Write a protein that binds this DNA or RNA. Structure first.
Ligand SMILES: [K+]
Ligand SMILES: [K+]
Ligand SMILES: [K+]
Ligand SMILES: [K+]
Ligand SMILES: [Mg+2]
Ligand SMILES: [Mg+2]
Ligand SMILES: [Mg+2]
Ligand SMILES: [Mg+2]
Ligand SMILES: [Mg+2]
Ligand SMILES: [Mg+2]
Ligand SMILES: [Mg+2]
Ligand SMILES: [Mg+2]
Ligand SMILES: [Mg+2]
Ligand SMILES: [Mg+2]
Ligand SMILES: [Mg+2]
Ligand SMILES: [Mg+2]
Ligand SMILES: [Mg+2]
Ligand SMILES: [Mg+2]
Ligand SMILES: [Mg+2]
Ligand SMILES: [Mg+2]
Ligand SMILES: [Mg+2]
Ligand SMILES: [Zn+2]
Lengths: 18, 25, 43, 222, 122, 38, 101
RNA sequence: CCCAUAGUAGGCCUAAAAGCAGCCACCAAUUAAGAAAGCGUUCAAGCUCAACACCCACUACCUAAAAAAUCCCAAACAUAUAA
RNA sequence: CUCGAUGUUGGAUCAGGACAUCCCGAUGGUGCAGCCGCUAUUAAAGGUUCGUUUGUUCAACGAUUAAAGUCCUACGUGAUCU
RNA sequence: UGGUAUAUAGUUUAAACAAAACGAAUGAUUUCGACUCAUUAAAUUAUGAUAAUCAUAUUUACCAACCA
C-alpha cells in the first residue's frame, strides 16, 4: 500500500581485479 | 536468525550450555 | 496450555533444554581423555 | 562508655565552580549526513575506556552494555542535581554526548527501498565503564541512595560504587579464580579447542572467557 | 566465521605434576603411539575427516600404531578430540621373527609376544 | 490493602507479618499504610 | 514505663517496695521501682503514693500493692523478673478498674 | 529498649522566621544532649533521632509478582552403600 | 499451508469459552459523617432492554434498566437462513 | 481515538528583548467641529527545563479511519 522511496546511491558494481 | 547482540538473553547451543555447567565455580 | 510458538528447537522463542547430571559426567569423561592426550603429545 | 572514633576530614578537598552536571544536547552541534551501520560490537564485551576514577570517589558502574539516548541523560542530570548538595558535592560526565546516529523508516513501509533517515542519536556503553563520577566532602552512604535510584532506571545493569567497593569487587573475583576447586575452566577448554568446542563458540569467547553473552555480563563466572 | 584452530604451544608442555599422574618419563620418551578413534567424523569439518583417513582410523575402536614424531603429532593435534592416544609398551621387547604369530595387543597398551592362552601357574 | 511487589514501611507504627503464605504490612495508626505482597 | 503509663495507676491507692540492697537477689525489685517511680506513671495518679522502705535484715524483697477496692497484690521478687512482676501488676490494674466501673 | 534540662526566640532578613522559608556563624552550661537529622506550628507549641545512664537489640544490607479463551495433564517418590 | 476453490461485510438462529467484573455477592483503604462516589482484593453460579436515521460494525439521539461489560471461538456459526 | 497547526496591548495584527492598526486620552489646528498631524496609556495560553529553546499538558482550528 504505502509506497516507499528509492535508494539514491548508484554504481559500486565493479568486480574484483584479481 | 538473530544477531549476536540482542535485547533478550539468547538461548545457547546445547553443547555450550553443557560447557557453562561444567565450568562453574 | 504450554504452547511453544512455531517450531520447538529453532527461532527466537525455543523450548528450554536443561543439563542433566549424566550429561555433565559424559562431558567430563571426554575431557579427561583429551587432557591425557595432550600429555603424550608433549614428548 | 560507648567508644567514639575519629571522623575523616574533607577540609583538604576543593569544589569546582560548576559542580552540577552540564546540559547534554539531543544531537551534536553539526548534524551528520553519512549514515552508519548498526555496529553492535560497540556495546559487546568489556570496556577499554573510563574504567578508573579520575577526580571523584563515587560513581555509577555499568554491569552491561547498552545505548544511552537523551531521555537517559536528563533523568541522570535532574535526579542528581536535585538530590545532591552543590556546596559539598560535585558531579561530572564520564560518557560523551549522543553521537551515533540511529536511522528509522517511516510507518507502514515494506522491506526494501534503501535505508531509513536519521531519527535520533545514542551513546554506546560497554560493561565495566563509569557513567557518572561524583565526589566532594561526603561519604559514600550519602550519595549511594540516589545514585542507585538512578542506576535502576538505566537500560543496562548498573550499580553505584566507590574506590573501595570497586577495588574489593575486583579482588574478590581474582580470589575466586585462584581458589576455584573445579579443574575445568572455560578458558582452558576454549583456547585448546577441547571437544571441538570452538564449533559452537565465537572468536570473542577466547578473550571474554565465558563472562559475556552478547551485551550481558556475568560476574559469578570465573 | 568458523575456521581452523591454532593450538598454543604452552598446551603441549607437560608439568611436573603431570608426570606423576600418567606415568611418563620426559627423559625417556615413548617411541610409538596407539591411536584409536572414539568419536564420529560426522558433524565435523571436512579437514578433520581427511586427517582421520590419513591416519587409518576409518573404523572406530580399531587400534592403529603411529610414530611419535612432530609431523605425525601435528596431524594428531587436529583431531585430538576424536581419538584416544596411548603409548605402546614392550615388556618383552620387540617381536622377533619367531613371535610375529604369537603376539597380542592388550588393553593396557602392552604388546606381549607369547600369547599362550593358559592360566598362570604362579 | 494495596498490592505491592516491594513492601515498605511508611511510619514507625507499621509492622511486617507473614500470613496466609505471603507478607503483609499492617498499621493501626494509619490504616492506609496497609500493603499486600503481590 | 511506657506500657504501664498508657494504662495508669487509677485504681491504685498505695505501692510499697521493700528490699535489702546488699543482698544479691534484689535486681528485679530495684528495676520494678525504677519504672513505677517514673514521672510518666506517677503523673497519672497523683493521689496514688509510691513508697520505698530499705531494710538490712537479710529478708526477701516483696512488692505490696494496695488498691482502692481494698484488694491487695503481693509479688515476692527473689525469683521473679521485673517484666513478670510488671505484667502481673498491669493485669490486676485492668481487672480492678473494670470491677469498680 | 531507654531517655531529653539550659545561655538562646544565636545573629541578620522578614508582617512574623522561636533547632527546622532563606544568608552568616555553628561557639558554649551540666557527668551527658547537633545554634539541629526527620515530622509538625500562620509564627509558636508539640512528636522523634543523634547524647548520658541502664546493659549484650549482641540482625541482613547478595535476588522480591503475575493473568486468556474445548479439559489440569503420565502415574508416583525425599533415607539399603555409582552401577 | 491452501489458487485440479479454505465462499469473503453486517445481521438472524444457537450459542461454547476466558476474566482484564457492567449489575447482583463478600472484603481492605479513602481527602468514607450519612445518602451518593473514587480505589484495590476475591468471585464467572445467574443476568446483561426496546426503539428513530444509517448496508453498516461503530456512532448520535429517544425512552428504560440492578446492569445495558470487555474479548476469543476460520473478524464463532451461509452442505441452517438472509 | 489519531496526528497536524494553534495563541502578542481592550480588541486588531508584524514579530518574541516587543513593531504597527482600530478605539481611548491629550494637545496642535478651526468661529466651533470633522479630517489630519503629534503625543500618551495599553500585551506576548499559562506550566517545567536550555537559558529565553526545546518539552509539558490545555486551547480552540485542521484533515484521518470497521469491513467485504
Ligand atoms: K520457536
Ligand atoms: K535497569
Ligand atoms: K526560622
Ligand atoms: K486459493
Ligand atoms: Mg565494490
Ligand atoms: Mg560483483
Ligand atoms: Mg547471524
Ligand atoms: Mg508448533
Ligand atoms: Mg540552644
Ligand atoms: Mg533571633
Ligand atoms: Mg534561624
Ligand atoms: Mg521545640
Ligand atoms: Mg518552619
Ligand atoms: Mg545548618
Ligand atoms: Mg535517643
Ligand atoms: Mg481438492
Ligand atoms: Mg479477578
Ligand atoms: Mg456470562
Ligand atoms: Mg467469520
Ligand atoms: Mg458451514
Ligand atoms: Mg483661535
Ligand atoms: Zn504506618
Amino acid at each position: 500500500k504505502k509506497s516507499g522511496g528509492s535508494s539514491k546511491n548508484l554504481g559500486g558494481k565493479s568486480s574484483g581485479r584479481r | 536468525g538473530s544477531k549476536a547482540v540482542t535485547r533478550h538473553r539468547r538461548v545457547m547451543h546445547f553443547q555450550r550450555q553443557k560447557l557453562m555447567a561444567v565450568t562453574e565455580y | 496450555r504450554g504452547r511453544i510458538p512455531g517450531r520447538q528447537w529453532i527461532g527466537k522463542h525455543r523450548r528450554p533444554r536443561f543439563v542433566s547430571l549424566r550429561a555433565k559426567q559424559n562431558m567430563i569423561r571426554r575431557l579427561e581423555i583429551e587432557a591425557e592426550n595432550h600429555y603424550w603429545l608433549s614428548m | 562508655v560507648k567508644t567514639l572514633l575519629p571522623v575523616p576530614s574533607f577540609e583538604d578537598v576543593s569544589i569546582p565552580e560548576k559542580p552540577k552536571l552540564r546540559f547534554i544536547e539531543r544531537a551534536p552541534l553539526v548534524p551528520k549526513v553519512r549514515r552508519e551501520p548498526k555496529n553492535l560490537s560497540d556495546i559487546r564485551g568489556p570496556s577499554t575506556e573510563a574504567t578508573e576514577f579520575t577526580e571523584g570517589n563515587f560513581a555509577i558502574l555499568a554491569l552491561g552494555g547498552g545505548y544511552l539516548h537523551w531521555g537517559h541523560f536528563e533523568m541522570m542530570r535532574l535526579t542528581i542535581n536535585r538530590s545532591m548538595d552543590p556546596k559539598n558535592m560535585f558531579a561530572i560526565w564520564r560518557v560523551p554526548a549522543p553521537f551515533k546516529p540511529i536511522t528509522r523508516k517511516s510507518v507502514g513501509h515494506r522491506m526494501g527501498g534503501g535505508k531509513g533517515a536519521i531519527d535520533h542519536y545514542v551513546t554506546p556503553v560497554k560493561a565495566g565503564r563509569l557513567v557518572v563520577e561524583m565526589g566532594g566532602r561526603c561519604e559514600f552512604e550519602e550519595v549511594q541512595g540516589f545514585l542507585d535510584q538512578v542506576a535502576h532506571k538505566l537500560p543496562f545493569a548498573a550499580k553505584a560504587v566507590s574506590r573501595g567497593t570497586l577495588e574489593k569487587m575486583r579482588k574478590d573475583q581474582e580470589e575466586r579464580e585462584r581458589n576455584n576447586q573445579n579443574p575445568w575452566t572455560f578458558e582452558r577448554i576454549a583456547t585448546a579447542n577441547m571437544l571441538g568446542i570452538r564449533k559452537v563458540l565465537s572468536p570473542y569467547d577466547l578473550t571474554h572467557k565465558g563472562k559475556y553473552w552478547g551485551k550481558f555480563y556475568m560476574p559469578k563466572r570465573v | 566465521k568458523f575456521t581452523r584452530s591454532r593450538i598454543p604451544e604452552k598446551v603441549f608442555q607437560a608439568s611436573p605434576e603431570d608426570h606423576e599422574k600418567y606415568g611418563g618419563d620426559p627423559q625417556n620418551p615413548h617411541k610409538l603411539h596407539i591411536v584409536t578413534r572414539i568419536k564420529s567424523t560426522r558433524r565435523r569439518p571436512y579437514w578433520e575427516k581427511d586427517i582421520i583417513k590419513m591416519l587409518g582410523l576409518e573404523k572406530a575402536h580399531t587400534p592403529q600404531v603411529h610414530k611419535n614424531i612432530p609431523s605425525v603429532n601435528a596431524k594428531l593435534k587436529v583431531v585430538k578430540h576424536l581419538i584416544r592416544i596411548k603409548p605402546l609398551k614392550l615388556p618383552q621387547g620387540l617381536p622377533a621373527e619367531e613371535n610375529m604369530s604369537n603376539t597380542c595387543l592388550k588393553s593396557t597398551g602392552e604388546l606381549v609376544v607369547q600369547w599362550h592362552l593358559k592360566p598362570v601357574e604362579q | 490493602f494495596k498490592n505491592k511487589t516491594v513492601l515498605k514501611k511508611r511510619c514507625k507504627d507499621c509492622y511486617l507479618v507473614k500470613r496466609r503464605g505471603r507478607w503483609y504490612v499492617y498499621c493501626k495508626t494509619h490504616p492506609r499504610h496497609k500493603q499486600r505482597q503481590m | 514505663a511506657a506500657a504501664l503509663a498508657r494504662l495508669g495507676l487509677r485504681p491504685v491507692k498505695q505501692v510499697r517496695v521493700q528490699f535489702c540492697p546488699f543482698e544479691k537477689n534484689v535486681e528485679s525489685t530495684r528495676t520494678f521501682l525504677q519504672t513505677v517511680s517514673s514521672e510518666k506513671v506517677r503523673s497519672t495518679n497523683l493521689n496514688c503514693s509510691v513508697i520505698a522502705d530499705v531494710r538490712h535484715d537479710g529478708s526477701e524483697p516483696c512488692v505490696d500493692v494496695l488498691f482502692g477496692d481494698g484488694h491487695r497484690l503481693i509479688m515476692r521478687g527473689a525469683h521473679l523478673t521485673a517484666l513478670e512482676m510488671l505484667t502481673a501488676f498491669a493485669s490486676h490494674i485492668r481487672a480492678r478498674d473494670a470491677a469498680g466501673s
